[PDB]
Amino acid sequence: MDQFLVQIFAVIHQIPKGKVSTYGEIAKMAGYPGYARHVGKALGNLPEGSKLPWFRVINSQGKISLKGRDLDRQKQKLEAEGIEVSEIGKIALRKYKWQPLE
Template identity: 65%
Template sequence: MDQFSIQIFAVIHQIPQGKVTSYGAVAKLAGYPGYARHVGKVLSRLPKDTQLPWFRVLNSQGQISLTGDSLERQAEKLKEEGVEVSDSGKVKMRVYQWQP
């Protein structure tokens, strides 16, 4: 596994239950500001049974960036943790954003 992925996973592992953050914030905290899209690519390659809380990462507007079944899966996982998700897949970042 490459160093970039290791650092991304380390940041995501720290996101507490019931909180969310953005791809850009993860990249910045990992030491790679401006690499939000790369964070998304790394997460898209995770196996379905991963224990990493990938679902706590959203786009900068607090929107789930996935579509179809993946959007539903991410929304359900967030709701299980008490995060309110609108029908369109949006989360109120000002309420649920993780502030490390």
């Protein structure tokens, strides 16, 4: 359990209802610029239904991080929050962007 994990997860616990964020943002806000790809490499190892909400953090491409079955599985957990997920796991960040400062 690296401090890297502790930090990025602490940021994930702060993701609100109906809003999502990207690995690029999470990494910078956690104090690890350029480790966005590593954040995803960690979330992919999480058990679905874990106390830590993995599904709320997607890629900087504006799409679902996992593919195949976990694509729709993440998608469903997003739909439960009221989030649009199109065919390729496409999420409109323009309206689902997490705004930490209003």
